[PDB]
Design a binder for this molecule. Structure first.
Ligand SMILES: [Zn+2]
Ligand SMILES: [Zn+2]
Length: 180
């Protein structure tokens, strides 16, 4: 008898089979974001990388193309978040850790640059960037608070410095945007 719409349906989509600790990522991300979204129902899926979006010179995929791929996926999900071990970029950036529709349904994170031998560090990074991109899907922009997960990170240093949590302001924004 769960109140209709009280369970956000998240789809975590693995774009390849080389994502380290995928199951831990999904478990941790699910637990983590539940603080903000409530108990979330996660579903794991696969998707094919869009080869047209692969830059052979860069050895990277255009993140937006992965979002388009996610957008094209069947299923009723409130959010579809992709993970890949392939490196991503966006036009005019050397790389991105991820990208999201802002706001919108899809986000994608690459673990390619988040890899670390330390599993806890790695998992925290992936959870952070998934949470960051998830924030964007809820219309959150970048947060000036460098400890906020919505802080824009363009390096590991920056990912590692910020918390996986939304700051006071972003939590309020996110709940405000969730109210809808
Ligand atoms: Zn961002
Ligand atoms: Zn914030």
């Amino acid at each position: 008898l769960v109140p209709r719409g009280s369970h956000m349906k998240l789809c975590l989509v693995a774009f390849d089979g080389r994502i380290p600790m995928l199951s831990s990522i999904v478990d941790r991300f699910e637990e983590h974001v539940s603080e903000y979204l409530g108990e979330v129902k996660v579903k794991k899926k696969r998707a094919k990388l869009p080869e047209h979006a692969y830059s052979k010179v860069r050895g990277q995929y255009l993140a937006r193309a992965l979002l388009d791929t996610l957008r094209g996926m069947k299923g009723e999900y409130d959010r579809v978040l992709g993970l890949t071990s392939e490196d991503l970029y966006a036009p005019g950036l050397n790389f991105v850790f991820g990208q999201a529709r802002c706001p919108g349904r899809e986000a994608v994170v690459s673990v390619a640059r988040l890899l670390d031998p330390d599993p806890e560090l790695y998992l925290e990074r992936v959870v952070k960037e998934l949470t960051h991109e998830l924030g964007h899907t809820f219309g959150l922009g970048h947060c000036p608070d460098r400890n906020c997960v919505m802080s824009f990170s363009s390096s590991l240093l920056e990912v590692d410095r910020k918390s996986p949590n939304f700051c006071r302001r972003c939590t309020e924004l996110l709940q405000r945007n969730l109210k809808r």
